[PDB]
């Protein structure tokens, strides 16, 4: 019977902000906007208040384990857990950024894969029955999968892969870039794309454990692509507004209590894609 709660990571701008706004109107309970920068997060909450909405705020940097754990403790204390988690935070380097490629790989992987993973380690145990988890991946993960060796494709499509095996492979990509050997070892050229392979596969693994370990709790967990969205990441020439980009993530967050699925899927335009 307690009040329900939804939370979005990377909520101060871009798709994440639009997701928060829609959950404020459509989610029955509190909605927590989180942001790594407290100033930007509070400004975004003030923006939504000027629109008539009442999100809560909590700081969260998915790359700081102490930030994650403080949020965990807040959720336990204030709500006794969590109903909806949207792992939206992510980064990408632009074309021709002068940062060395192996550092771009390390940095992008650190946030998009390892930060996401650490949020899930701490917050998935808090998800309540009928909860939903939404991981914002990218269609670039499907695109990058095709460019992997056959051996890595089999590993990434496996229904038996463990989280610890995936972790090893994600770190292997990054180390291989530093050694100048990633393509020889079967990896694609796109570092961002490999990080999103990690998000997609992590989603599949976490869904399988939910089915294995929490039969009966009616939790649904999926990965998704929001499409090509005008944000600071993609720039102003992209196809969709943030409002449009939010639609598939919000759909997946708000799947009705009696939904049988999707679960463990990669979803774009509200439709399941083959992995
Ligand atoms: N735009 C697009 O076309 C597409 C985007 N995506 C994915 O959608 C998600 C949102 O992207 P988008 O809105 O475009 O990007 P933006 O750059 O506009 O927004 C990214 C959000 O993530 C936050 N963030 C980044 N790193 C961290 C971190 N360490 N801890 C907490 N928050 C963090 C940012 O905070 P801050 O303001 O402090 O930087 C910001 O709130 C990402 O996962 C992206 O990979 C997928 C497909 C397409
Ligand atoms: C119907 C939903 C809940 C998606 N929605 N969206 C919006 C909306 C409209 C314009 C921009 C935006 O971000 C959201 C909205 C509104 N203004 N009033 C009532 N419901 C609204
Ligand atoms: C630059 C192109 C047009 C190839 N692009 N970029 C993206 C893109 C931009 C930023 C992040 C991301 O994951 C993907 C994209 C997309 N989601 N769908 C279709 N085309 C896309």
Domain count, the chain: 1
CB of 233 sitting under 6 A from ligand 3: yes
Q: Name the residues annotated as catalytic.
A: 192
**Elucidated via:** X-ray
DSSP E strands in the chain: the ranges are: 5-8, 30-35, 56-59, 82-87, 127-136, 220-225, 266-268, 271-273
Tokens 């409002």 correspond to 243
Cα–Cα nearest to 217, from 257, 246, 266, 245: 257
Helix (H) or strand (E) holding 169: helix 163-178
Backbone interruptions in the chain following residues (C to N > 2.5 Å): none
- Eight-class DSSP state of 95: T
* Cβ atoms < 10 Å from Cβ of 26: 12
Q: DSSP alpha helices (H): ranges in 87-135?
A: 101-109, 116-123
The Å distance, Cα 254 to ligand 2 centre, comes to 16
**DSSP code per residue over 27-47:** SSSEEEEEESSHHHHHHHHHH
Asked if 102 and 174 touch (Cβ cutoff 8 Å), the reply is yes
Find the domain containing 14 and state its range: 1-275
Asked if 8 and 253 touch (Cβ cutoff 8 Å), the reply is no
Q: How many CA atoms lie within 13 A of 130 on its CB side?
A: 8
How far apart are alpha carbons 247 and 1 in whole angstroms?
28
CB of 93 sitting under 6 A from ligand 3: no
Task: Find the helix packing angle between 14-26 and 38-50, rounded to 10°.
Answer: 50
Resolution of the experimental structure, in angstroms: 1.2
- What's the token pair of residue 33? 């906007």
How far apart are alpha carbons 107 and 92 in whole angstroms?
9
Ligand 2: residues whose CB is within 6 Å?
Answer: 21-22, 25-26, 243
- What's the token pair of residue 38? 């407290």
Can the peptide bond before residue 262 be classed as cis, meaning omega within 30 degrees of 0? yes
- What's the token pair of residue 160? 């038996």
Q: How many CA atoms lie within 13 A of 105 on its CB side?
A: 21
How far apart are alpha carbons 233 and 254 in whole angstroms?
26
Q: Which residues, in sequence order, are bridge partners of residue 119?
A: none
- What's the token pair of residue 68? 């994650």
The Å distance, Cα 125 to ligand 1 centre, comes to 24
How far apart are alpha carbons 45 and 179 in whole angstroms?
44
Known binding site for NADP(+): residues?
Answer: 8-32, 61-62, 88, 192-196, 229-231
The Å distance, Cα 22 to ligand 2 centre, comes to 7
Residues 6+ apart with CB under 8 A from 239: 227, 228, 229, 230
CA distances, 190 to each of 11, 94, 198, 215 (Å): 26, 12, 13, 37
The domain that holds 13 is classified in CATH as 3.40.50.720
Residues 6+ apart with CB under 8 A from 21: 48, 51, 53, 246
């Amino acid at each position: 019977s307690g009040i329900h709660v939804a939370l979005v990571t990377g909520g101060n701008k871009g798709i994440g902000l639009a997701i928060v706004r829609d959950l404020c109107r459509l989610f029955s309970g509190d909605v927590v906007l989180t942001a790594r920068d407290v100033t930007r997060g509070q400004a975004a909450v003030q923006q939504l208040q000027a629109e008539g909405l009442s999100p809560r705020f909590h700081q969260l940097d998915i790359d700081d384990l102490q930030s994650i754990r403080a949020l965990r403790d807040f959720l336990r204390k204030e709500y006794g857990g969590l109903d909806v988690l949207v792992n939206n935070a992510g980064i990408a380097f632009k074309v021709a950024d002068p940062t060395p490629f192996h550092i771009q790989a390390e940095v992008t992987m650190k946030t998009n894969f390892f930060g996401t993973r650490d949020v899930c380690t701490e917050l998935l145990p808090l998800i309540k029955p009928q909860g939903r988890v939404v991981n914002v991946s990218s269609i670039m993960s499907v695109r990058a999968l095709k460019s992997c060796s056959p051996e890595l494709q089999q590993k990434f499509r496996s229904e038996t892969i463990t989280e610890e095996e995936l972790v090893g492979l994600m770190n292997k990509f990054v180390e291989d870039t530093k050694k100048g050997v990633h393509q020889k070892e079967g990896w694609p050229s796109s570092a961002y794309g490999v990080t999103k392979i990690g998000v997609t596969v992590l989603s599949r693994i976490h869904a399988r454990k939910l089915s294995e370990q929490r039969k009966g709790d009616k939790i649904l967990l999926n990965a998704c692509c929001p499409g090509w969205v005008r944000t600071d990441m993609a720039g102003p020439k992209a196809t969709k507004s943030p409002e449009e980009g939010a639609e598939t993530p919000v759909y997946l967050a708000l799947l009705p209590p009696d939904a049988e699925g999707p679960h463990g899927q990669f979803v774009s335009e509200k439709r399941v894609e083959q992995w």
